[PDB]
Structure 1
Amino acid sequence: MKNVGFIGWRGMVGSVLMDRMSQENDFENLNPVFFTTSQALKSAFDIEELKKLDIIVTCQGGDYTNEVYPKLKATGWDGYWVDAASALRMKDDAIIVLDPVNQHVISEGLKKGIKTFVGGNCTVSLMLMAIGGLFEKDLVEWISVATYQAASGAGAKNMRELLSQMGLLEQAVSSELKDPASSILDIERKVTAKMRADNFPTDNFGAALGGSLIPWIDKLLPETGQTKEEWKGYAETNKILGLSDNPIPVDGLCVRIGALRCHSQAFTIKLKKDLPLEEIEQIIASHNEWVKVIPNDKEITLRELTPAKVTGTLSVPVGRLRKLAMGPEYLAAFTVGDQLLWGAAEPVRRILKQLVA
């Protein structure tokens, strides 16, 4: 069987990949070779040991990829490079994977001779897993996005900082909260003071996340005024769908909120045609087996459409579906999906499964 190498398997995204692969018994269909960057297992920088492999799966990061990949391709290596990092997504000899949405694009690349397959941006992947049916029927003119992004997208230290921040905000008023008759304005004054204090751990985010939000993710791109995260909305959605010759506009604001691992998104989707709400609900629901249409009811939305419910699951619920006041061609949609799964480890796990078949 196929000889597969794994790099960055001990990190957060890598650990979710290892766990999901173990759960689905994916190691039974391949010969795994584990790599490490440590000088304390084979070396991840040994080009000759990597040349022996048929497939390479890396969750190590962009800095590793930009160093090792060109050296390995310069030796004449004919194998497959599977990456979770952004580094190679926008290359001509690379395809962005998300098989329940773009199986036809992947299959055509496997025929053409493309050897580099990269997992897509979290926010973009979770969006496409939710409203993919609409894109399959070419019913989307444009999408306006407003995201509610989790700390896991920024890293492991970032999740820890959020949790530490949440603790200090409560601990600043712990006794006052246990007193049923205490002043709310006094309580708030104290947590806001702790949030603004010098000793408040803001090292990883550069601002407070717990009890707040940060309307900026990744570096500024002077060209459009977007952040790299917001830019990926237009750039990646179209490369995944293969519609780079006829680009469908996807833009908006990417905001970091106090959630652990689920990214949630508010959409304003402009449709090309006027279809009834019941027909749109079926088109969304029938695309894939993970998307779930949550009815526009209070009790069900509170139980289903939240980070609380979807964390650690493969389920991609989409709700709050209705027509907007600016015309029956404007659709409202809210989705919640796990960042580490469909937004990181799952598309990577799925393309590997296909390559070793």
Structure 2
Amino acid sequence: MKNVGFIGWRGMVGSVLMDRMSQENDFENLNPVFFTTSQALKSAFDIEELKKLDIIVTCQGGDYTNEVYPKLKATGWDGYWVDAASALRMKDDAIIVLDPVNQHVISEGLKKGIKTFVGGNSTVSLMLMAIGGLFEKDLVEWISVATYQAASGAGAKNMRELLSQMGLLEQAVSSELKDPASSILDIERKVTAKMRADNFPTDNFGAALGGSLIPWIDKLLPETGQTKEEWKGYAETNKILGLSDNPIPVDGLCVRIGALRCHSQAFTIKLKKDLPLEEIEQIIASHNEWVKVIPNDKEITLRELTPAKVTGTLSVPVGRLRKLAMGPEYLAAFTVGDQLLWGAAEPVRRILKQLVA
């Protein structure tokens, strides 16, 4: 069978990948070799050991990639490189994977001789898994986005920091909350005071997240004023769909909220033509087996369209669908998706599966 090396399999994303591969019995169809960066398992920095592998799957990160990758291909190695990190997404000899959406793009690359495949930006991937249909019919002129991103996208320590912040806030008024007759503004003043305290743990986010939000993710790109996270919307959406010749505008604001691992997004989709809502809904629900169209009903929306419902599942609900006041060609849409699955580990697991078949 194909000899597959795994790097960064112990990290958070790597861990999800390992769990998903086990659940699906993916290890039965390949010969796994595990690497580590520890000096305390082959060495992740042993080029000769990596050179003997047919495929390398890394969830180690960009710094690792930028270091080892060049060296490895510099030895002639002609194997496949599957990466979760963003390091190589924008390279000419690499393809961004999300097979339920761009399978045809993936297949052509395997023929052109493409040997590098990279998982895509979580936000963009979750968007495409939700409204892939609209793009599948060149029905989208542009999309304005507003995200509600989870701590998992930032990292494990960030998730822990969010949780600690939540605890401290409640702890600040634990007794008052138990007293059904206590003043709410008093409670409010105290939690806000704690949130602003110097001892409030905000080292990882650089600001409070629990009980608040942060309208800024990643570095500023002076060229356009977007953060790198927002920049990936236009850049990655079009490379994934392979439309670098007829790019579809995708822009908006990426905001961090206090959710653990599900990214949510509010959309304003300008459609190229006036179409019936019922038809839009059918097109969306038919693109893939994971997207799930939620009726624009309160009770059902509260049960299905939330991080609480989606966390840890492969389901990608999309709802609140209706026409906007700007015109019958303006579509409103809200979606929730797990950041660690379709937003990270899953696309990686699925391309590997293809490569070892």
TM bucket, shorter chain: over 0.9
Deviations 1:170-198 (A, max 9, x none): 00000000000000000000000000001
Distance between the aligned counterparts of 2:42 and 2:99, measured in 1?
31
Distance between the aligned counterparts of 1:221 and 1:62, measured in 2?
19
Residue 339 of structure 1 deviates from its aligned partner by 0.1
Residue 25 of structure 1 deviates from its aligned partner by 0.2
Residue 68 of structure 1 deviates from its aligned partner by 0.1
Deviations 1:52-109 (A, max 9, x none): 0000000000000000000000000000000000000000000000000000000000
Deviations 1:197-226 (A, max 9, x none): 010000000000000000000000000000
Distance between the aligned counterparts of 1:41 and 1:57, measured in 2?
15
Residue 24 of structure 1 deviates from its aligned partner by 0.2
Deviating beyond 6 angstroms after TM superposition, the runs of 4 or more aligned structure 1 residues are none
Distance between the aligned counterparts of 2:100 and 2:41, measured in 1?
34
Deviations 1:240-299 (A, max 9, x none): 000000000000000000000000000000000000000000000000000000000000
Distance between the aligned counterparts of 1:207 and 1:303, measured in 2?
31
Deviations 1:302-323 (A, max 9, x none): 0000000000000000000000
Structure 1 SS opposite 2:274: coil
Residue 7 of structure 1 deviates from its aligned partner by 0.1
Residue 145 of structure 1 deviates from its aligned partner by 0.1
The percent of aligned pairs where both chains have the same amino acid is 100
Structure 1 SS opposite 2:207: coil
Distance between the aligned counterparts of 1:72 and 1:60, measured in 2?
16
Aligned to 2:123: 123
Unaligned runs of 5+ in 2: none
Aligned to 1:194: 194
Distance between the aligned counterparts of 2:347 and 2:38, measured in 1?
27
Distance between the aligned counterparts of 1:109 and 1:356, measured in 2?
16
Residue 114 of structure 1 deviates from its aligned partner by 0.4
Aligned to 1:289: 289
Deviations 1:7-54 (A, max 9, x none): 000000000000000000000000000000000111000000000000
Distance between the aligned counterparts of 1:317 and 1:300, measured in 2?
11
Aligned to 1:223: 223
Residue 138 of structure 1 deviates from its aligned partner by 0.3
Q: Aligned Cα RMSD in Å?
A: 0.2
Aligned to 2:170: 170
Aligned to 1:308: 308
Aligned to 2:41: 41
Distance between the aligned counterparts of 1:194 and 1:278, measured in 2?
48
Structure 1 SS opposite 2:33: strand
Structure 1 SS opposite 2:106: helix
Distance between the aligned counterparts of 2:144 and 2:308, measured in 1?
25
Aligned to 1:338: 338
Residue 168 of structure 1 deviates from its aligned partner by 0.1
Distance between the aligned counterparts of 2:261 and 2:71, measured in 1?
35
Structure 1 SS opposite 2:328: coil
Aligned length: 357
Structure 2 SS opposite 1:288: coil
Residue 350 of structure 1 deviates from its aligned partner by 0.2
Distance between the aligned counterparts of 1:305 and 1:58, measured in 2?
32
Residue 348 of structure 1 deviates from its aligned partner by 0.1
Distance between the aligned counterparts of 2:269 and 2:261, measured in 1?
25
Aligned to 1:83: 83
Unaligned runs of 5+ in 1: none
Distance between the aligned counterparts of 2:353 and 2:147, measured in 1?
31
Aligned to 2:97: 97
Residue 324 of structure 1 deviates from its aligned partner by 0.1
Structure 2 SS opposite 1:221: coil
Distance between the aligned counterparts of 1:74 and 1:153, measured in 2?
32
Distance between the aligned counterparts of 2:245 and 2:34, measured in 1?
40
Structure 2 SS opposite 1:265: strand
Distance between the aligned counterparts of 1:23 and 1:343, measured in 2?
18
Distance between the aligned counterparts of 1:61 and 1:248, measured in 2?
29
Distance between the aligned counterparts of 2:22 and 2:215, measured in 1?
37
Structure 2 SS opposite 1:18: helix
Structure 2 SS opposite 1:258: coil
Residue 149 of structure 1 deviates from its aligned partner by 0.2
Residue 153 of structure 1 deviates from its aligned partner by 0.1
Deviations 1:104-126 (A, max 9, x none): 00000000000000000000000
Structure 2 SS opposite 1:350: helix
Structure 2 SS opposite 1:185: helix
